[PDB]
Amino acid sequence: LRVGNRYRLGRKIGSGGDIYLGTDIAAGEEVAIKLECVKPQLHIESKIYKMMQGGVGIPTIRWCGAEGDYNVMVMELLGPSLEDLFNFCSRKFSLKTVLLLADQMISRIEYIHSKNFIHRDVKPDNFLMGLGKKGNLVYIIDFGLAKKYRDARTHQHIPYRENKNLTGTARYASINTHLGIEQSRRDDLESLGYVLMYFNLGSLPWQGLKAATKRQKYERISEKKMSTPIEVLCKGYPSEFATYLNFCRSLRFDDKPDYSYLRQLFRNLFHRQGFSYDYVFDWNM
Numbered sequence: 001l002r003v004g005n006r007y008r009l010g011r012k013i014g015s016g017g018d019i020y021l022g023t024d025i026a027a028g029e030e031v032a033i034k035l036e037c038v039k040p041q042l043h044i045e046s047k048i049y050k051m052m053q054g055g056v057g058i059p060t061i062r063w064c065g066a067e068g069d070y071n072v073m074v075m076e077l078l079g080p081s082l083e084d085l086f087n088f089c090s091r092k093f094s095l096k097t098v099l100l101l102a103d104q105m106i107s108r109i110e111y112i113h114s115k116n117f118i119h120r121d122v123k124p125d126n127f128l129m130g131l132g133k134k135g136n137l138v139y140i141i142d143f144g145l146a147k148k149y150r151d152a153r154t155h156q157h158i159p160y161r162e163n164k165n166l167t168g169t170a171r172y173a174s175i176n177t178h179l180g181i182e183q184s185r186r187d188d189l190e191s192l193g194y195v196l197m198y199f200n201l202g203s204l205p206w207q208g209l210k211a212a213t214k215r216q217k218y219e220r221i222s223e224k225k226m227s228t229p230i231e232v233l234c235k236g237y238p239s240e241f242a243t244y245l246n247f248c249r250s251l252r253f254d255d256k257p258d259y260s261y262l263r264q265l266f267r268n269l270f271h272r273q274g275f276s277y278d279y280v281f282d283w284n285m
């Protein structure tokens, strides 16, 4: 079974809505292939990927097209997601690994923002480690929910609006996203703050809530998230994680985040440990 007369389809390797391992027959290396039934967001997403190409940690798209009952996108092969690796590490990351990940993840989000888009679904499942020579590089994937937030030429910001439906993953959504406020740059970074504390804790305190329908469940998540102060969420971990989250929640809708300040919070903590720290992630030790 071939895709584009040139890619051999292999076994399924995930879903993000089905991801297959593939082989570039001509070049002889493996690839990742995403197939979508013609119902649609793959072609729109491919254009965003191609707008982002060249950035550090942005995957390369090898081919786009249609094959029978599927729209197809072929991407360079990447490794397991950070969720996969978190589970492999028994849902415990060392502080070193969390700080190493935080530095790269802030930079990936900054790059997307520099290209005039907001990601709007920041979660561990959308960060993948490279393979082989790129095993120390964090990649970001999935622009199916991404949105342009400013004009490319003038940088004029999209307007503030409310009554927006939740586009993303409830567990990691910002408070203002739960309130139905238009997402902006601050919300990508606030979601990352929850991801980092997720890595620190093994789970977040608004996980595991049940309800009749999705809407009621999101309301339960919203209530618990709003009633858990950052100081309680982050107790027992270096204060930098609370400082990060408080900074993100204090950003105005239109504010350009101080990415450098946020990276330096964690970089200073990392460097203060001196030689007691490596540049080796837990799963490579």
Ligand SMILES: COc1ccc(-c2cc(C(=O)Nc3cc(-c4c(-c5ccc(F)cc5)noc4C(C)C)ccn3)n3c2CN2C[C@H](O)[C@H](O)[C@H]2C3)cc1
Pocket (backbone or CB within 6 Å): 013, 014, 015, 016, 019, 032, 033, 034, 073, 074, 075, 076, 077, 078, 079, 080, 081, 084, 125, 128, 131, 141
């Ligand atoms: C021999 O050594 C090896 C070999 C392979 C691996 C290897 C490679 C992968 C993998 O998923 N790669 C991958 C996935 C995507 C991808 C896409 C996507 C694909 C194409 C496209 F155009 C746009 C998006 N959308 O979503 C995903 C993720 C979330 C699934 C993109 C690029 N790369 N996984 C493994 C290892 N596995 C362990 C566990 O079982 C995981 O589930 C599975 C994941 C590790 C070691």
